Symmetry: D2
Subunit: 509 residues, 4 copies
């Protein structure tokens, strides 16, 4: 019984990964292919929501750094205008004891209370002397943190911050995900800055990342998707997969439609994939994995951008005076992420939670704040009070004066937000992925692979690109199995226009 | 002006590297391509010569272990019959003080005289203690050796042997080529064997062609190539390379135009043919050694003591060769059958035969290698006599043994020497050539011994093409450690592209 | 009220320590002095007992190495003839798995089952590697052992043997007592003998110790005591101290006699001293000290000395096929430690434990075996049965045949056998000794100072000598406070005839 | 034949070492003894000279820390009044880049310029990381310095300073002499101070109120029975016959001894013995000569330099390696304000306005300069260069009026801890010992570790105690042992003397 549709390669999911596979599939333009997604808007969790008042909010951060030229070609194609991008300085600050400590944290303890400085330096001196002798590798994320920068810096930043991040204690996670690099501290660099009292960090003006002028991050994956042949695309309720028969290689859609495939590139969460296949073996193995939920809170506020935050990026918060682990002045990325000044809007509430004087609609200008909070069984989140608690924190950290007028609020909860690099992660993945692979199924992506190391928009995109390259050209899936390898090098070989397309085109001439 | 022939991808050289490139270019079957070689018989320095008496002798050894599936696939295609191959045990012995020490050397010191075992163990104990503290990497091959297995084993084996091999002292060579594995000994392993007296079944295996020798593989492989895209013989000899206009001048005058050039000739010859004085200067910084390949056919049965098909390494001074093997053990067709009659040329002791009568066999064969360089000269007139004598000293030939054949050929460019100055030159030479759309690859193409093996060189060409076409990462070129530490299964002789393009017609 | 007797320096106890003080006091011959002991026979716990059948047994071992020339002069004086001493080779064996493993045990594992050789070598290799990096000192006797020769040799010899010796597990003892010599194994030496199958250790022929030709060890201290002015000695029931009044510097004897002193050198067990002072403070502190009891078993046997046991030395037993931790062929030290061959003695029992054939008295020759068993609250000893167990042990270790005729037996139990180098030892001693010192009481000796490191005859003797030298000439008590210092050097300065005596005799001339 | 005099024990030299032997010989009061010295004034190179103007200068420093109670007892006896001593704080400074770095140097790098602190901490971070792995002992003085405090502190202070002191590069000297304390820096201690910006290293030493340091040894000698002494031209040793145990004096007097305690320089001793074997071995020893300069200045003492202590100078803007405001130890080391003295010259070197003698008050400075075959010293200009240095280091204003100058050169100033030292002494000392000669002292034993006044004094004390009571010579053979502990056992009144007195009663 032949299916309704028959393609060589079927890509499920129109996120960075899905589009990655699709963009390479369409570049090779050889075997037949098709891409599906239950959402009519391509980009997935890399999209950009908007508020009724017109405030944009990235659901999945932004690419501050790409490791592949291929990824760059694909972005340059979608948004080819210099006016499509706003280059920004890669900045970073850590909120510690009423201080904005620039990245990296260690090289800036010179602006912490001197007593604290001592506890830190001593801690590193211990880590530096133990490293000089260390003959083993760290077993947990915790051990990895100590060895790298002593207990002192381990009690002020890393430990407490990484809990608010992964909602899981550092002792329950592996550390191989961080890289192959030796866990050894640099005393000279840290002591020097303390002595000179010198402060530094970020990078100027060389280290820069680009952000899309309009539409937020979602606009990027939208533009890319539009470079595809629309007949091969299938987005919306018509593209929602409900059943996956790995045995006869047939996918059933929600309406009932069935698609046959020779190779399957799945970018949905593997735990969902397992159920769609109804394989109690995979469902059992997938349950061994672990993830955290994330609350993306947004806050629009009237007035110009406060001097004390100026040029921006993200801010890390290791302390207790706030529920969020990181924040960001999203208004600093592009003026079009907010309504213009002329736009008039009523004030919903003040920063202290008080009532607005008047309900009248006053005009801008406007600036916007975006932040994130993690949820898991070890770190529960009150869905109702977390938005108000964030606004409180924004005040505690002195990012909002209680007299600040909030014009817009935002709050969405993502069940699958962070593929946790637990200690049991690989023990499970070393079974799951091979099994799926035996069924000619390439499960790749942030939750398709379940490896945070390669969950970035540039990594995920290449996962798809490489999964395909493997299926067709038998290319090695580097990013999937060797994160350190790709990260520690400039990947420039593969381009949007390889010698194949060059020769086939000059072939006509 | 337009050249006589014009192809997208021109491959120069018909060795494993060249044939590797050709195989991928022919698999992809997209962009126009052509492979040339000044020699009319494909295979290059991986070919098999034959003596007038009928003895086979490979000139570039054989593959004991493949690192890629794509390499196996191409071999299966050239020799599809099980009968085309013989499977042998991977084994190795070091001749040290009248003893045959199993590989690996350090795990079998229990074969050495005990007094010597002490000096080895003590040395490793020093190594083990220093490794516990080491915070840097070895800088020379010699440093690496010491850290790995101490001075005891260094003076007994590693140091003397590696000079006989590279014709260059261990102190003049880098050590990164050996891999990125930490230079630290394993006492517990070494001590255990000595204590238990144990000497380290199915075992791992390698395959050798039933007929033709190693060269027979590359001939069969080249046959699966569209003959019209091949040009072997004096008609394919490259005499000039114009990198500016991308044109290659053959010996007969024929000119070939290319977009991409995969050159597999010695990069010092390439620079010459380009008349690029800059490259010639840089290329002079590289170093290499010359190898003498000697072969000896002898009447009678094989010595009982040495039945295994493998390598025998010789660190000592009682023989000029550093490497030897009973080539007749690999396949019974590397030497004439028993019924064939041949006269005795000389006895192993160098004496004269009693008569010139042509008698029957059977026959066994030995091959051995000798290295030559400015730091290690070789008398080409007496080297063979010295080898035979050495074959007596190592008790591989009785002075009474009857020698039936002698083979002797000298290869100018034998080994690409991993010197301390190598990468210093190669990081200039390769990128520049790359800026002219020229992929200089291979044993002497890229000059890296780490990947100068048959299976490595073959992939250097394959990957080079895959880089030119599908924009693949040349992993074997820039990351020997990576490809060597894993099983390269992805790339196949039949990839998804061919499967899908074919089933499409259906 | 004034004491019946008055001296400047009073020495309580006529063991090696007390005798040492007396000898230096008689040599100086300046300040008035007197030495008392409740025992009629001088020598203390370094005496020699005799069985009815005429077998000698040292209750306190014998000197195998002198660390001081002064100790030599005094022995030379007491026993001036060459026919008074027998010089023997310092040899030693450890009984391990049916093998006599020469000292040191590590350098002779080349005699154990090869499977054992492996576990030992690996252990040392681990020890050698950790030592190269070690930046701290061992805290207990156990850590010190592991650091020296790895767990392999630790589980085979050290650990089990040292419990049988100290009646306390190696984890409950300090290791400062062993010396300041760095705990690091010698791999090359050990592996060499294993490879060569070489055997050596019990040094010869210049590593020698001398032994008294007659009277056993006890004869030495009896001869040494005789060199003293008898009117200054007071041994027997007339010399028993029953009370010490530190406040008015008076001692009360059993008969009621009182001796007044300026300085007191008390060589009795410090815990008993505290009790004879009625000082509850010192009694409490002294309770924190720990000791073990020792049973000394003797076995006289008919026949010549077997060939295997051969020469004169000590034998160590880590294994539990015997109750004793060390044994010695006491008949090899001197022919006069047992009856002559013409002496007729009946057979008491056979080694197997059965009753002999006839009760008739037969001739010799005879040989003797001496051994020791420790006792504590953690290692109890059945006093009624331990003798038969030792004899059984001698059979199991194959020192006696079941057919060997036992002619004599000996069994004495010493309550205070060994001063135990527990972890709490110096916590108490650094309190006890100073307090007694403030009262002008030099508490010195095996149980006077409670430090086993210097509890030997040669050490003890000097503890007394140096105590007197400190009292009179203000000398430094090196042996008491710096064990390593004296042991690691040749003490030749102090002689039985110093310049003081020489210049006084020549001034005479 | 028989000698003019015959004693059981003869002591040669009335310096701290010799007097230490005489003090114990007299305390024991048993065997016959006598002590000689070619100088009528006892104290040796621990004496105190005086300028014609009335300024005192110690030729051999002063004790800042005693390691023996016996040493204290003997000074207490010589100067029994409390008014005899002044107690000052133990302190010292290093002059580095117009800065006064408190001791110890490392713990006060927070006084150096910021940039310099980086080089120093970076250097120590290297030293600390290497010591964590070190498995051998330093072979030279230099190696010891590099391991202890890194190359930064080495190039800035230690290396250049030590050459000015020993007149020999740090690479030519052993390092056992500094002690057996593990050569390893303390980062936490050093970093803490820099971080806290705090400055730190009560602890005191005593200095005689009158007569300077020499006054001490003069009083100590006075406690000896004069008939057993013999100081002056009459006590000069000119010959030593070690075979018949007879010493000849300059006048011709012959002294017969049983044991000889010689405290003269061992190289001179060998000469006086006419023993070519020892003379040869003695040549392997090395020493530096020292110049002791004294400056008398009119007016009050500079504000910033009020503490009486040592000031060390590693830099080359002055020839001296150490200096001290000797006028801060006691107001009696210089003339009283009412004293009238003419100005000899100004600190800038120029001439005075008038030659009239004006009143004080006065203050004083002393400094030391080393000399050797590897560090020559011009004797005719060294004084003027030291004055210039005092100006460069800003201790003297070019307008300061100099009222007195002192300059003496000592051939045998310091016993150099060279690499060859022990190889020579382990032969020389035993050989003399076999001849019943106890060659002890600063140049008698040649070991700088124990060449201080408190050590030297004990070298004699223990030499006698060895000859008489058979005591171990700890100070001679185990400097670390005696230094790392408080030596309280031996006292000026031992139990021997208590029991002899109470025996009379």
């Amino acid at each position: 019984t032949h299916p309704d549709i028959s393609v060589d390669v079927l890509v499920i999911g129109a996120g960075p990964t899905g589009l990655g596979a699709a963009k390479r599939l369409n570049q090779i333009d050889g075997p037949s292919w098709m891409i599906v997604d239950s959402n009519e808007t391509p980009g997935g969790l890399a999209s950009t929501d908007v508020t009724p008042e017109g405030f944009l909010y990235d659901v999945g951060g932004h690419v501050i750094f790409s490791h592949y030229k291929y990824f760059d070609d694909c972005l340059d194609e979608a948004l080819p205008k210099e006016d499509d991008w706003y280059t920004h300085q890669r900045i970073s600050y850590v909120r510690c004891q009423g201080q904005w400590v620039p990245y990296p944290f260690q090289n800036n303890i010179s602006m912490l209370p001197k007593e604290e400085q001592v506890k830190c330096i001593d801690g590193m001196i211990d880590a530096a002397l133990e490293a000089r002798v260390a003959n083993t590798k760290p077993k947990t994320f915790d051990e990895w943190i100590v060895r790298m920068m002593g207990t002192g810096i381990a009690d002020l930043f890393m430990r407490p911050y990484n809990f608010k991040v992964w909602a899981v204690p550092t002792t329950k996670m592996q550390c191989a995900w961080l890289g192959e690099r030796v866990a050894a501290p640099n005393l000279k660099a840290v002591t020097t800055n303390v002595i000179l009292g010198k402060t530094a960090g970020n990078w100027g003006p060389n280290a820069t990342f680009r952000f899309p002028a309009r539409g937020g991050t979602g606009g990027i994956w939208i533009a890319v998707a539009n470079t595809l042949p629309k007949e091969k695309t299938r987005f919306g309720e018509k593209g929602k997969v409900t059943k996956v028969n790995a045995n006869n290689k047939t996918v059933t859609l929600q309406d009932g439609t069935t698609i046959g495939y020779k190779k399957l590139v799945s970018t949905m969460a593997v735990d969902f994939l397992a159920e769609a296949m109804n394989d109690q073996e995979l469902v059992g193995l997938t349950k061994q994995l672990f993830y955290s939920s994330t609350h993306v809170i947004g806050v629009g506020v009237r007035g110009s951008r406060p001097e004390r935050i100026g040029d921006k990026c993200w801010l890390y918060f290791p302390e207790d005076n706030c529920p969020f682990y990181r924040a960001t002045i999203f208004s600093n990325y592009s003026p079009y992420n907010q309504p213009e000044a002329s736009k008039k809007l009523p004030t919903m509430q003040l920063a202290d939670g008080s009532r607005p004087q008047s309900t009248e609609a006053k005009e801008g200008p406007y600036w916007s704040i975006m932040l994130e909070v993690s949820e898991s069984s070890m770190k529960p989140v009150n869905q109702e009070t977390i938005l108000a608690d964030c606004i409180q924190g924004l005040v505690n950290t002195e990012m909002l004066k209680p007299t600040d007028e909030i014009v817009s609020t935002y709050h969405r909860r993502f069940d699958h937000g962070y593929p946790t690099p637990t200690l049991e992660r690989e023990g499970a993945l070393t079974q799951i992925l091979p099994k799926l692979q035996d069924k000619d199924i390439w499960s790749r992506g942030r939750f398709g692979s379940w490896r945070y190391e390669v969950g970035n928009q540039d990594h995920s995109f290449m996962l798809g690109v490489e999964a395909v390259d493997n299926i067709v050209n038998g290319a090695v899936e580097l990013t999937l199995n060797y994160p350190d390898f790709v990260n520690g090098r400039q990947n420039t070989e593969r381009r949007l226009v390889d010698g194949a397309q060059v020769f086939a085109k000059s072939k006509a001439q």
